[PDB]
Scaffold this active site. Structure first.
Site, PDB file in Angstrom:
ATOM      1  N   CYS A 150       0.815  -1.217   0.000  1.00  0.00           N
ATOM      2  CA  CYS A 150       0.000   0.000   0.000  1.00  0.00           C
ATOM      3  C   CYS A 150       0.852   1.273   0.000  1.00  0.00           C
ATOM      4  CB  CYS A 150      -0.945  -0.044   1.204  1.00  0.00           C
ATOM      5  SG  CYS A 150      -0.058  -0.412   2.764  1.00  0.00           S
ATOM      6  N   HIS A 203      -3.264   0.720   7.051  1.00  0.00           N
ATOM      7  CA  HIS A 203      -3.464   0.696   5.619  1.00  0.00           C
ATOM      8  C   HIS A 203      -3.392   2.135   5.150  1.00  0.00           C
ATOM      9  CE1 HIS A 203      -4.738  -0.281   1.667  1.00  0.00           C
ATOM     10  NE2 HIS A 203      -6.031  -0.050   1.820  1.00  0.00           N
ATOM     11  N   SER A 214      -4.022  -2.995  -2.220  1.00  0.00           N
ATOM     12  CA  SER A 214      -4.544  -3.694  -1.055  1.00  0.00           C
ATOM     13  C   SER A 214      -4.781  -5.131  -1.481  1.00  0.00           C
ATOM     14  CB  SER A 214      -5.833  -3.035  -0.538  1.00  0.00           C
ATOM     15  OG  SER A 214      -6.626  -3.948   0.187  1.00  0.00           O
TER      16      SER A 214
HETATM   17  C1  LIG Z   1      -0.246  -2.012   3.491  1.00  0.00           C
HETATM   18  C2  LIG Z   1      -1.015  -3.303   3.314  1.00  0.00           C
HETATM   19  C3  LIG Z   1      -1.564  -3.433   1.922  1.00  0.00           C
HETATM   20  O1  LIG Z   1      -1.004  -3.234   0.878  1.00  0.00           O
HETATM   21  O2  LIG Z   1      -2.850  -3.818   1.951  1.00  0.00           O
HETATM   22  C4  LIG Z   1      -3.182  -4.327   3.277  1.00  0.00           C
HETATM   23  C5  LIG Z   1      -4.617  -4.011   3.498  1.00  0.00           C
HETATM   24  O3  LIG Z   1      -5.570  -4.281   2.455  1.00  0.00           O
HETATM   25  C6  LIG Z   1      -5.684  -4.998   3.719  1.00  0.00           C
HETATM   26  C7  LIG Z   1      -5.484  -6.481   3.581  1.00  0.00           C
HETATM   27  C8  LIG Z   1      -6.784  -4.545   4.649  1.00  0.00           C
HETATM   28  C9  LIG Z   1      -6.502  -4.936   6.118  1.00  0.00           C
HETATM   29  C10 LIG Z   1      -5.210  -4.345   6.605  1.00  0.00           C
HETATM   30  C11 LIG Z   1      -4.013  -4.912   6.566  1.00  0.00           C
HETATM   31  C12 LIG Z   1      -3.765  -6.396   6.592  1.00  0.00           C
HETATM   32  C13 LIG Z   1      -2.774  -4.073   6.711  1.00  0.00           C
HETATM   33  C14 LIG Z   1      -1.816  -4.216   5.519  1.00  0.00           C
HETATM   34  C15 LIG Z   1      -2.235  -3.545   4.202  1.00  0.00           C
END
Ligand SMILES: */C=C1\C(=O)O[C@@H]2[C@H]3O[C@]3(C)CC/C=C(\C)CC[C@@H]12
Lengths: 28, 242
Positions: free
Chosen positions: B109, B144, B161
């Protein structure tokens, strides 16, 4: 092609092959 | 963990990545045995960095930018290949985004936020500002972040994500409140409780700007605020950016 460019190429192929496997595992 | 030694990955970081794989994957050792040194792995095309005709509407440019970010793939390896220091001057972070497009490895992210700024600096009628989320699920907290955007008075988001509905939002939300509430609802559907939202200031379109990104101009405690004050704080942030 230089040794450094070759290494990045070989590494990138293994990174994506690994990412495919680890992507399949995380949903399990 | 974060790769600190640049690219190509150095031997110690490379071995540490594979040690992590062997630990957490059921087969683990067989995974590495089939990949490491293999001579017949797929050749992954270097994704083409999107470029745009002046006649292409900005929302359609944003679809292409998001498609590019998606094509890099979510990084599931356990090793973050690019080190991101959030307080770095924008010009240094843009050199990083350029390297990401040249080396073309998987990302998550925060990397996608940097990339999304880099790929929209050519759109001065678009404003970009980061939005971070802190959520709670099954006794644990999760963080996130995405790149909020504003075009022609409407709000959307770009990002990366694991869930479709926690990254890309076409710029159709009439208010910042509605955009953020949509993320809150998306989280709710996968059983996360939204605890905090941190919203940054608009980011300069100059990739040689020496200024820092302002990540946490507004920090909103969703539970303490309650519904109406939550809305009010978001509209105030939207005015602060205008
Ligand atoms: C920085 C992370 C990313 O790239 O995506 C996840 C995020 O989409 C999720 C899976 C939502 C729930 C939160 C996380 C597991 C944190 C990590 C980010």
């Amino acid at each position: 092609k230089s040794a450094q460019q070759e290494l990045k190429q070989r590494q990138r192929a293994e990174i994506y092959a690994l990412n495919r496997v680890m992507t399949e595992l995380e949903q399990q | 963990f974060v790769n600190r030694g640049g690219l190509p990955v150095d031997e110690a970081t490379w071995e540490r990545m594979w040690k992590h794989v062997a630990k957490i994957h059921p087969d683990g050792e067989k995974v590495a045995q089939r990949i490491r040194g293999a001579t017949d792995l797929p050749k992954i095309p270097i994704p083409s960095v999107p470029t745009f005709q002046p006649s292409t509407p900005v929302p359609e440019r944003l679809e292409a930018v998001q498609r590019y970010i998606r094509e890099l793939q979510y990084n599931h390896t356990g090793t973050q290949f690019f080190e991101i220091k959030k307080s770095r001057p924008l010009t240094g972070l843009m050199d990083l985004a350029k390297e990401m497009t040249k080396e073309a490895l998987p990302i998550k992210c925060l990397e996608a936020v940097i990339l999304g700024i880099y790929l929209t600096n050519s759109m001065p009628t678009l404003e970009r500002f980061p939005i971070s989320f802190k959520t709670y699920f099954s006794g644990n907290y999760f963080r996130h972040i995405v790149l909020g955007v504003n075009f022609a008075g409407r709000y959307g988001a770009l990002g990366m994500s694991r869930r479709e509905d926690l990254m890309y939002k076409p710029p159709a939300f009439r208010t910042l409140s509605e955009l953020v509430l949509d993320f809150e609802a998306a989280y709710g559907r996968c059983w996360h409780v939204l605890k905090k939202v941190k919203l940054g200031q608009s980011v300069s379109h100059d990739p040689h700007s020496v200024e820092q990104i302002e990540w946490k101009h507004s920090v909103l405690d969703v539970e303490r605020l309650g519904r109406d004050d939550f809305r009010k704080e978001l509209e105030r942030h939207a005015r602060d950016m205008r």
